[model samples]
Target: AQNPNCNIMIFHPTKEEFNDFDKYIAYMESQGAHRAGLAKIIPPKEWKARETYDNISEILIATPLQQVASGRAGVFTQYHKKKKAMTVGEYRHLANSKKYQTPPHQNFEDLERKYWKNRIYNSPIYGADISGSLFDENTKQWNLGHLGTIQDLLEKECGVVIEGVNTPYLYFGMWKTTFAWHTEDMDLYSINYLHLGEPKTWYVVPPEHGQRLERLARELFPGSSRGCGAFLRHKVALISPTVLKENGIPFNRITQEAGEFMVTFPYGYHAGFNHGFNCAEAINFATPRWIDYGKMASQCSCGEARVTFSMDAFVRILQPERYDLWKRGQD
Candidate 1:
């Protein structure tokens, strides 16, 4: 589904004085508000229950921690795809092949062109911000520094307070896939509301619920790798909750209105697809303390010593040229 531009509106309500949701809706309507309040397009009967089942078998599975840790050894690349679980040779060949040329800015366009190539389930998950080019094709890039700087601005200038969490980074990538699913180390969440398009489908798996579900799927499906067994990654983007009322195309509604959704960072697991036409959105989420590899290495290739080791190591790694200034502080 394509996207329509959207805005956001925050209303402060006092329940005792405001009365009810209808009153709020009426007030918004009076103020010329165009959309409903966090409406869901899917009926209540169709909502998937998100829960965890008992693990009597004690699967004793290992966390992706080691893989994640190793991935931090370098910038964003398909290191995980190179592991035992994945056939790296195939991936590398694809990378080297003319079919998979690197995009100008290392954005999804490259990934989409090489890997997706018209696949219906194509989508790339990234932590990078390409908001400037969310709708534009030419400006996207792999500038982590620029992203970090924007994150800083969102924090310092916009007064957005970010909390540290272990949630995996997620994004709604377009090219081929409807959605992509992933998880991070900590707990956090976020949501994307498509303001213009057909009804989207979202498959959600709550924390710790995935393991049991996989086992059940494996037993029931038999010979099916599609279900169960810690599917480390799954598709998460589904159709937005409000698609039905506006038809498969809501470009006009989404464009001239404000749209909103929630985000669970560090830990929320969900995916969606937009069969609809075009959509718009107002996304709000907090940035967490990210310790990706580059930062970690620049800080200390070996690892930083805490108070026990003089700030010497940290200062050297973080600001090597400022050794003298750091030393003066130590003095």
Candidate 2:
């Protein structure tokens, strides 16, 4: 999955591009690279990308009080902390508040750049989990069946391997919104589909050199590693591709356009910011290789294990069938 160039493969298929569903799956499997792009599945007219924040905000304001209270939504400041947890109505009010609006004296472009350096209000609008009854009928229409359900086959067969993980969550990002650098849970694969909005720019580091980058961060920013006890939450300094390149680390930059799919393979260090307002859905899944990585993650020096799956538990589940073959591989 880790390639030298760190390029993101783009796929453009017509309505009848593939003969059947099997072929489509095969094509996705054959891409040795970590990330791949799928053409726009929904028409632009149906899902307007630019007006997403305004449209969703209006809907949230009109939502019933009981239902809005039941929804779990948080406002994140630049520090990635929940500034406050409020009802959908309250969030809507804050979004429309004149005080929060970008001032005429401030340049929007400069403000976007500041997001990378400081802790500012990162207006991340998240919707209810796709699993429960949280998603309504209108939201359900955005689910592009075949491509969207690509991970179902693996989940169905390997449910025991990832018992605690949940389905994809919907993310609504506005200008200057940031997602910090981190890999998928347990180094599993993830697919991010941008339904509509301005493109999101991504910076990716190859899987092979992930540790090197980690070490570099620790070296340059003392205590950033937190003795490797909790690397993900250490608030480690963020490094850009330009800085990494100066240090001889190879990286990739991709501006994920509206209606494109971005897939991240195991151990790929990726971080990015929304160019403007956008709506995207992301989910994680595993392949056979992920089992080995899960075991490694459990024993990592981080002291705190981030993965939920246990190799021992996985073997026990599979012990009844072909246990000998599994044992031999471990040996």
Candidate 3:
């Protein structure tokens, strides 16, 4: 809760660049946007991006409210919690309620309002394969789900849903709901679109520093497992930007407001919290480029930390498409 933010250049792409997700995101990453690890995208005015969880409005969900110390309780090896459950409507009531909130502090308008904004986290990511409104429909809004940004042979030919990887995962946040540092499943590129809520504060490490930070996290959480390449998959750890700096590992901290999107570069590690009650949807996608990186993940996958999807299956589905193209060419 006590660190200055990074001033990475947030790219304001034209409608053309925003719409052409495949080409556009690749260009941005190549243009050094990956240095930020988590690059944000504010849509072109054409794509009016405003949304709420009304689609699944009254549906009951596993609303486990994580209990934590006030303020950015830095690098929690683990978090204690209260047994809880709620519907989308009830969660909104809690997020907007005065219960569990505290008074604002001196010069802490942004980072010090520990209560609603000072929430506890580890998990708030809910499944979206069930909600067509959130995942299937493609409007002229700020949704990366259908955008080629995440499209790959998997969905097109396989017709499969890889829970948090290819399928959209809806996230609810308020105050300090922390999604501890972690890379995407199978090292895929993931994008989070904050549908509505207070800004989310994020700390990200470029792929180059992922190992350094992983080793540091291992030291910090001595009791945690070490064999997995994605050691932070447990979503039970948090670290300060200053500590990263002190350890000579580079990182970037950014605030994501409503109607904006954050892209996590392949193998990049990211962690953050909601400023207040907000809804965000995130999903992972792959381009031909992610093949090598994903392969590395396959090798590093340890027992319980194994990869989420089958690389061979994804590739197998594309074989049909290739044969069709080849047949057409021969004819």
- What's the TM-score of each model vs. the native? 0.28, 0.62, 0.74
Question: Which is the winner by lDDT between candidate 1 and candidate 3?
Answer: 3
Q: How good is model 1 by TM-score?
A: 0.28
lDDT by residue for model 2 over 1-331, one digit each (tens)?
A: 4333545655554445433434543465476454321212222334332333433443232221111111111212123323434444465454345633333325434544454443233344333223211223454332333232323434555664333334555665554455656776556667677766656778777776677766666655555355554365332235655567778766776677776667677777787766554567776655665555544441223433223333334444433353344344334
Kindly report which residue stretches of model 3 are placed more than 4 angstroms away from their true locations once superposed: 1-7, 50-56, 63-72, 79-84, 102-138, 148-151, 154-165, 226-230, 298-331
Task: Give the per-residue Cα lDDT of candidate 1 at 62.
Answer: 22
User: How close to the true structure is residue 250 of candidate 1, measured as C-alpha lDDT?
Assistant: 20
Candidate 2, poorest ten consecutive residues by summed lDDT: 64-73
The alpha-carbon lDDT assigned to residue 166 of candidate 1 equals: 17
- The residue-by-residue lDDT of candidate 3 on 214-323, one tens digit each, is 88988777666555444586566777665677788778777888878888878888876666677777777777667666546522223333333543343233343333
Q: Provide the overall lDDT of each model, using Cα atoms, as 2-decimal numbers.
A: 0.28, 0.49, 0.61
Task: Look at candidate 2 and give me any clashing residue pairs.
Answer: 49-197, 78-119, 78-120
